[PDB]
């Protein structure tokens, strides 16, 4: 059941296969060579993030229109991290191709956008306003009806 992954840090994580196989990426790799020993490298993940996604995948090993309010309680608590970490989880979710993680992280970012002002949105995500007043006022007016 057990296998081990190595982050870009060099650090080695040993995890049950069932859990790890929730990363389709990892699952594909195991076919591309011996399934079932010897560690497998994950160059695009650091150990801090990897450690996190191991936690996520373990908690979820069992399991089975777009609503943003149905994030389980455990995941909300799990995603109580800084924005840096949050976006690296998304990238990890991508790289490792774990659809479940990709959703909740994306959902979590979407709720960050909900109920905000264009400028507050920018202040939250460090989005440089480059629009000239004229062209901004244009999309403003263009989006009157909401």
């Amino acid at each position: 059941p057990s296998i081990k992954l190595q982050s870009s840090d060099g650090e080695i994580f040993e995890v049950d296969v069932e859990i790890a196989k929730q990363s389709v990426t990892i699952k594909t790799m195991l076919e591309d060579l011996g399934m079932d020993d010897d560690p497998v490298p994950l160059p695009n993940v650091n150990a801090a993030i990897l450690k996190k996604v191991i936690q996520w995948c373990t908690h979820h090993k069992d399991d089975p229109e777009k609503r943003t309010d149905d994030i389980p309680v455990w995941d909300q608590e799990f995603l109580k991290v800084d924005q840096g970490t949050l976006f690296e989880l998304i990238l990890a979710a991508n790289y490792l191709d774990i659809k479940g993680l990709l959703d909740v992280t994306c959902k979590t970012v979407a709720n960050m956008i909900k109920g905000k002002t264009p400028e507050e949105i920018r202040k939250t995500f460090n989005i440089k306003n480059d629009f000239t007043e004229e062209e901004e006022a244009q999309v403003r007016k263009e989006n009157q009806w909401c």
Binding site: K107, K114, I127, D130, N143
Partner: peptide, 14 residues
């Protein structure tokens, strides 16, 4: 995951 009102708001960040 966002509805039109919200997409509108972020549509004018850049």
């Amino acid at each position: 995951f966002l509805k039109a009102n919200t997409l509108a708001r972020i549509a004018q960040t850049c």
